Amino acid sequence: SRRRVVITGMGMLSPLGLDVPSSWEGILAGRSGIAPIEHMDLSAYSTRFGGSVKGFNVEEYLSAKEARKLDLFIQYGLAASFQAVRDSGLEVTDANRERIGVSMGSGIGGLTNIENNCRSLFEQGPRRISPFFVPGSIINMVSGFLSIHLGLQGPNYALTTAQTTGTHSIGMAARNIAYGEADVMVAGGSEMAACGLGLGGFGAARALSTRNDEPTRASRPWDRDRDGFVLSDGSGALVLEELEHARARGARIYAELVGFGMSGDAFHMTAPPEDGAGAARCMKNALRDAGLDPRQVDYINAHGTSTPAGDIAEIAAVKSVFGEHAHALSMSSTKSMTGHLLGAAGAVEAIFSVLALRDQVAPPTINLDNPDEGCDLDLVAHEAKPRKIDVALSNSFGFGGTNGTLVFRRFA
Amino acid sequence: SRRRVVITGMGMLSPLGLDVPSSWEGILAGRSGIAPIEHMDLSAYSTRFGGSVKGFNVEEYLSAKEARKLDLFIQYGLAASFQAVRDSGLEVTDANRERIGVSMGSGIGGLTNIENNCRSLFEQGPRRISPFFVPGSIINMVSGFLSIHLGLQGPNYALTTAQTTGTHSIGMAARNIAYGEADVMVAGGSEMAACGLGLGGFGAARALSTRNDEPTRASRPWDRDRDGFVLSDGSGALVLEELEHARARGARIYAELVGFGMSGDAFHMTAPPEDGAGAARCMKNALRDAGLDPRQVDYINAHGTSTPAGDIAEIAAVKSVFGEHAHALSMSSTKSMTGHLLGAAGAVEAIFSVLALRDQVAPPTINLDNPDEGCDLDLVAHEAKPRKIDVALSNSFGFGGTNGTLVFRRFA
Numbered sequence: 123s124r125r126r127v128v129i130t131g132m133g134m135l136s137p138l139g140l141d142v143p144s145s146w147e148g149i150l151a152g153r154s155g156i157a158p159i160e161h162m163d164l165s166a167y168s169t170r171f172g173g174s175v176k177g178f179n180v181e182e183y184l185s186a187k188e189a190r191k192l193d194l195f196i197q198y199g200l201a202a203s204f205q206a207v208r209d210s211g212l213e214v215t216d217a218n219r220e221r222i223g224v225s226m227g228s229g230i231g232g233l234t235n236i237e238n239n240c241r242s243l244f245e246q247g248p249r250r251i252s253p254f255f256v257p258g259s260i261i262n263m264v265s266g267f268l269s270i271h272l273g274l275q276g277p278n279y280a281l282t283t284a285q286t287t288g289t290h291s292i293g294m295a296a297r298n299i300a301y302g303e304a305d306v307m308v309a310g311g312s313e314m315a316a317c318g319l320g321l322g323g324f325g326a327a328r329a330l331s332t333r334n335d336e337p338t339r340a341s342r343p344w345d346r347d348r349d350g351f352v353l354s355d356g357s358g359a360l361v362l363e364e365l366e367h368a369r370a371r372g373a374r375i376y377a378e379l380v381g382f383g384m385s386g387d388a389f390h391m392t393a394p395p396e397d398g399a400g401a402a403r404c405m406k407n408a409l410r411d412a413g414l415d416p417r418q419v420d421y422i423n424a425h426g427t428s429t430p431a432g433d434i435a436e437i438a439a440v441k442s443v444f445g446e447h448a449h450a451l452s453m454s455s456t457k458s459m460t461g462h463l464l465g466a467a468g469a470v471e472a473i474f475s476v477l478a479l480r481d482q483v484a485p486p487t488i489n490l491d492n493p494d495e496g497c498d499l500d501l502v503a504h505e506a507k508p509r510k511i512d513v514a515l516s517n518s519f520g521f522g523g524t525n526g527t528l529v530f531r532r533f534a
Numbered sequence: 535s536r537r538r539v540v541i542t543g544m545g546m547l548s549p550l551g552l553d554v555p556s557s558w559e560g561i562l563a564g565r566s567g568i569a570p571i572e573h574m575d576l577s578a579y580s581t582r583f584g585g586s587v588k589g590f591n592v593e594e595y596l597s598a599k600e601a602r603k604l605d606l607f608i609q610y611g612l613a614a615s616f617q618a619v620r621d622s623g624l625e626v627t628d629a630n631r632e633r634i635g636v637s638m639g640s641g642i643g644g645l646t647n648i649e650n651n652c653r654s655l656f657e658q659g660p661r662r663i664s665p666f667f668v669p670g671s672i673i674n675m676v677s678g679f680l681s682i683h684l685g686l687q688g689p690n691y692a693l694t695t696a697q698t699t700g701t702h703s704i705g706m707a708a709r710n711i712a713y714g715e716a717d718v719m720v721a722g723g724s725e726m727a728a729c730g731l732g733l734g735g736f737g738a739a740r741a742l743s744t745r746n747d748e749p750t751r752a753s754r755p756w757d758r759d760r761d762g763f764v765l766s767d768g769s770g771a772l773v774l775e776e777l778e779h780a781r782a783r784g785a786r787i788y789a790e791l792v793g794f795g796m797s798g799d800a801f802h803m804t805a806p807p808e809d810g811a812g813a814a815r816c817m818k819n820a821l822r823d824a825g826l827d828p829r830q831v832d833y834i835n836a837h838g839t840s841t842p843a844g845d846i847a848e849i850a851a852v853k854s855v856f857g858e859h860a861h862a863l864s865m866s867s868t869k870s871m872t873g874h875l876l877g878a879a880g881a882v883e884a885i886f887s888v889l890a891l892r893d894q895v896a897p898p899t900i901n902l903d904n905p906d907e908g909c910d911l912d913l914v915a916h917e918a919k920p921r922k923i924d925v926a927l928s929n930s931f932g933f934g935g936t937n938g939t940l941v942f943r944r945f946a
C-alpha cells in the first residue's frame with residue numbers, strides 16, 4: 123500500500139506575473155505574457171520575442187552577493203521554491219528536517235551563464251571564468267541551495283527530462299512521499315533559455331514561431347496558422363505533503379495528487395508519433411495509477427506547444443484514451459498565453475491544473491481562431507469556462523519521446 | 535509490495551578501457567588512466583591532464599552520421615548502455631517493451647557541444663548554430679536516444695545531481711522496479727566535461743589537482759600531499775531487473791541491489807561538512823533500507839575524490855557509522871586510478887563494487903604513500919587485496935550537499 127499526497131503550497135514566476143495569484147489572474151483573463159525580448163540584440167535571429175519574467179527582484183529572496191553566484195534559472199527556481207514553502211506555512215524543525223526534501227529540475231540549465239563565461243573564455247582566456255561558474259550553473263543547485271537555506275535533509279535531487287522536467291519532478295516527488303521516503307517535497311522546475319543559444323538553438327531546428335509582427339498571436343495551439351512554440355522563462359514549485367502530516371498541522375490543502383504516469387515514445391529525437399501513442403500510454407498509466415476510469419476526467423491542461431506535429435498528436439492521444447468521453451472533458455493549452463517554459467512548463471501547468479480544481483474553471487486556449495483538421499474537441503477557445511472539475515490531468519511530452527502525466531483530484 | 539532488484543548487465547567506458555573487463559583489469563593491476571590531455575591546447579590552464587577515454591570508436595555502436603549530431607557524453611552513455619543491454623542477454627519484445635525504461639544521467643551534459651556552438655555564435659552568428667544543438671547536448675537524450683534505438687517504452691528520465699548523479703540514477707531506477715513501475719531499467723551516467731569551460735570552470739574554483747608534471751600521481755585520496763580532484767571522462771550503465779523476471783528468463787545475476795540512501799547535507803554549495811554528517815546520514819539510510827547490521831559491510835568503494843576536505847569527511851562518516859567495525863572492513867577509491875568521472879563516477883564505481891563481489895577482491899587506493907591525520911582505516915593502499923566480500927557499499931557526494939549510497943550483496 124501507499125500514502126496519499128496533497129498540495130499545500132505553490133510558488134511561481136511566469137511571463138504573466140511574479141507569483142501564483144497574479145499569473146492565475148492573467149490565465150483566466152486570457153492575457154498574453156509574450157513580447158519582443160529586451161536588453162538583448164536579436165537582429166540576426168528569426169525569432170525576436172517570447173515570455174520573459176518582467177520585474178523580478180532577486181533581492182526579495184537572496185543578498186545581491188549570493189544572487190551574483192547563481193544563473194537566472196537557479197534564481198527563478200529558488201523564488202518559486204521560497205514562495206511555495208511560505209504558501210504552505212510549513213515549519214522545518216530538528217524533528218522533521220530529515221523528512222523534507224527537494225526535486226527542482228531544469229530542461230536546459232545554465233545557458234545564459236555558460237554564454238557569459240564563454241564570452242570571457244574566448245575574449246580573455248580561462249582566467250576570466252567565474253569561480254562560481256560550475257556550482258552557479260548546474261541544474262541540481264536549486265535543490266542544493268534550497269536545502270542549504272532551509273536546512274532540508276530529505277531526498278535532494280534534480281530531474282532533467284527536457285520539456286517534461288516539471289511534470290516528472292512533481293510525480294517522482296509524490297512517489298517519494300507515497301512510498302514513505304519523505305513526508306514533504308518541494309518539486310517543480312525552472313528555466314531561462316532566452317539567451318542566444320536558446321533562441322539560436324531552437325531557431326536552428328526551425329522549432330520556434332517566427333510571427334515577429336504579432337508576438338501575442340504567435341502561440342496558437344491547435345490553430346491551422348500555428349508555426350512552432352514560443353520560448354518562455356520562469357518557474358513553478360509545489361509543496362507536496364503526506365495527507366496525515368498535512369491534517370495534523372492544520373495545512374490548507376489545494377488538491378490531491380492521485381496519479382503519476384511516465385512512458386517513452388521510443389519514436390524520434392524531437393517529433394512525437396502522429397497517433398500520440400506515447401501520450402496515450404502515459405495518460406492510461408497515470409489513470410491506472412490513480413485507480414480512475416478515463417470517464418472521470420473533466421479537465422486536461424495539454425502540453426499544447428503550438429507546433430504542427432505536437433498539437434495534432436495530443437488530439438489523437440486524447441481520442442484514443444477517452445473514446446466517447448473525449449468531447450465531454452475540456453482541454454486547453456495555457457501555453458497559448460504563457461508560451462513554453464520548457465522544463466518549468468510542467469510545474470506552472472500543474473499549479474494551473476490545481477487552481478482549475480479550486481476555482482472550478484477551465485483556462486482558455488487563446489488565439490484558437492481556426493481549429494485545424496481533427497481539432498474538434500472542447501479546446502476552451504478564447505475565454506475561460508466555468509464547469510465541474512473533480513479530476514484534472516496535466517500532460518508533458520518532451521524531446522527523446524519522454525512523456526509525463528499528473529492526475530489531480532479535488533480534496534474536500 | 536516491494537520487489538527485489540538484481541544486476542544482469544554492465545557496460546563502461548573509462549580512462550582504463552573501452553569496456554568493463556578491460557577497465558576492471560586496470561583496477562586490479564593499480565594502473566592510472568590519467569595523462570596530459572591531447573584533444574585541445576591547455577597551455578593557458580593551471581590543469582593540463584585528466585582521464586580521457588582513449589581510442590573510442592563510436593562506429594562500433596552508431597553510424598558516423600548520427601554520431602556527428604551527438605555530444606561525446608551522449609556517445610559515451612549509448613556505448614555503456616548498449617554494452618550493458620548486450621551483457622544482460624535481455625530481448626526487447628512487444629510483450630515487455632513497456633516494462634523496460636532508462637535513467638542515464640549526467641552532471642554537466644553537452645558542455646563541449648554548447649561551447650562549440652557558443653564559439654560559432656560569437657564569431658559567426660546564430661545562423662551557424664547546429665540544428666542538432668538542443669537534442670545533441672541536453673542531459674535526457676542518453677535516455678531518449680537509447681529508448682529510440684532499442685524500443686524501450688518504460689519510464690524514460692535523467693537525473694542531474696553533479697558528482698552523485700550515477701549513484702542516484704541507479705538507486706532511483708531500482709526503486710522504479712522495487713515499486714513495480716518497471717521490470718527492467720538501464721541506469722547509470724556519462725560525462726565528458728574536458729573542454730575549456732570544464733577544466734577552466736573547475737580550475738577557477740581551484741578544485742583540481744595542479745600536478746601537471748606527474749599526472750598518474752595526481753589522484754591520491756587520503757594522501758597528505760593531495761591537492762584536488764582529477765577530471766575524467768566516460769560512462770557506466772547497469773541492467774537492473776526484478777529478481778523473479780531475471781529468474782524466469784535464466785539471467786546471469788552479478789549481485790543484488792539491497793539498499794539505497796539519499797540525504798542532503800544542507801551544509802554548503804560545494805564543501806562537505808568536515809565530520810561527514812551528510813554521508814553518515816546517507817549510509818545509515820541505505821544500511822537500514824537493506825535490513826543490515828553495519829558489521830555485514832565488507833567493502834566500501836569510497837567517493838574518495840582526492841580533495842583535502844572531502845577525503846577526511848569520508849573517514850569521519852565511516853568511523854561514526856561503523857564504530858569499531860570501521861577497522862575490519864576495507865575501503866578504497868578507484869578514483870586513484872580512473873580520476874573523477876563526475877556524474878558517471880557513481881556508475882563505474884557501482885560496477886567496480888559489483889566486480890569486488892564477483893571476484894572477492896578489494897581494489898587498491900594507488901598513490902596512498904603517506905596517509906593523512908586520522909586516515910588509519912584499511913584503505914587498501916597500493917595493491918588489490920583478496921578478501922571475503924558478502925556486502926559492498928558505493929558512496930557518492932556532490933555539489934549542493936547531495937549524497938548517495940548503494941548497497942550490493944552476493945546472490946545465490
Ligand SMILES: Cc1cccc(NC(=O)[C@@H]2CCCN2)n1
Pocket residue numbers: 336339347491
Ligand atoms: C494568424 C493571425 C494573424 C493576425 C490576427 C489573427 N487573428 C485575429 O485577428 C482574430 C480572428 C478574427 C478575429 N480576431 N490571426
Ligand SMILES: Cc1cccc(NC(=O)[C@@H]2CCCN2)n1
Pocket residue numbers: 653654657658
Ligand atoms: C568558429 C570558430 C572556431 C574556433 C576559433 C574561432 N575564432 C578564432 O580563433 C579567432 C576570432 C578572431 C581571430 N580568430 N572561431
